Amino acid sequence: PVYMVYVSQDRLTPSAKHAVAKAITDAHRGLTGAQHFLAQVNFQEQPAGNVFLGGVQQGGDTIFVHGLHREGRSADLKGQLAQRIVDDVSVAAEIDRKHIWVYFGEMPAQQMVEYGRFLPQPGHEGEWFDNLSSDERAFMETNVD
Amino acid sequence: PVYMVYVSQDRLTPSAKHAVAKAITDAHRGLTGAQHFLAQVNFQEQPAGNVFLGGVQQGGDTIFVHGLHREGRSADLKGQLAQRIVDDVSVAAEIDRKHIWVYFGEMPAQQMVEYGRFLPQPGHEGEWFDNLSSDERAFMETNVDV
Amino acid sequence: PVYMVYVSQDRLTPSAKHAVAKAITDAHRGLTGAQHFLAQVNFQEQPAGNVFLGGVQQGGDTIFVHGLHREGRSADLKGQLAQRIVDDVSVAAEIDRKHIWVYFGEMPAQQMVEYGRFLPQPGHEGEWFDNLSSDERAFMETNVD
């Protein structure tokens, strides 16, 4: 998965940012089973007053999570994972839940490419990880906090 | 809905952004009936020159509207709302129509969240609002323009 | 197509950005037959450290390509196109494959407007072009390289 996480400029300190990433990443790991280093969190900072709700300019507290996942998982699982993101971001970022929107879009795994390679289908990530070369495993191996 | 709006830096003043954010929101409200406040308009500004069309760098007039919706609305409707976004953003950003691109994406309501809560289908806008805690109902209230 | 390209700030020199947009656009015109001027490359630049893999802050080397297409193409063509984008962006921007992510999301053309007009079905680019006003025809023909 890639998680586009839109936030106001400077709303998240580096460590705040770190904690929101580890919050999402862990939630995805805990729920899907996918290994950490497949979970990308991409922060998109914009200056305050760029978001608008019902046509009302907003300060700097809004958080929009756009998760892009592989097709394959159930409605129930995705709502658990969306709910856990609303809750664990709320805490990691010290922002009210009322401030957090979370959308999940899905695409066939076979039109999705990470570390230069097409993803496997959900739940069969491990045999996938194993048929990668030495250098590719090493690189992804590093990306586990 | 969340309308992501990709614009070149300084192409829209604060007041330009309002008129755009109000044009999109009014189009969505009027055409869907979904209550005003549910629509977020989110500007992503980049330096001018970060947009290429067929490999040619552009100035700062290009606007891309990515619209992220619940599934359930007909194609004829989605066509209307995209055409009216194109016209109403054009007026409001003082920008020619050829410069405006508009994609709509659809996800199930069950995997979309707003104001920390899980959205309903387009056919449940008013009853959903009524199973909300009064503090949420009053917070969303403040998010309706004028 | 719109291709959203999420790069760390200043990693692509202007010259690189140009090469990276030319290559994606050449890839998409080669494999799908759509005319050049139909392909947008939208570069999104964030400060390095905004990208997290497995919850680990990254340097400025990650490239996430998010392509937005018509529905219409086969899983086979789309993996060709994705794979050609990885290899070509690699060369163009001088970045190992391991750093490149590519997601293809698709939508019905009837909710898809470029240059102020709804796009046709993939492969009907010819007659749709042969129905645009002379000014529109002239305008788009400007954006080909």
UniProtKB/TrEMBL annotation, chain B:
Q: Which domain of life is it from?
A: Bacteria
Q: Which Gene3D superfamilies match?
A: Macrophage Migration Inhibitory Factor
| Coiled-coil parts of chain | none
Source species: coryneform bacterium
For the ligand ((R)-lactate), the binding residues are: 28, 70, 73, 114
**What is the phylogenetic placement of the source species in the record?**
Bacteria, Bacillati, Actinomycetota, Actinomycetes, Mycobacteriales
Task: Tell me where in this chain the Tautomerase cis-CaaD-like domain is found.
Answer: 1-128
InterPro entries attached here? Answer: Cis-CaaD-like, Tautomerase/MIF_sf
Annotated protein name in UniProt? Cis-3-chloroacrylic acid dehalogenase
Encoding gene (name): cis-caaD
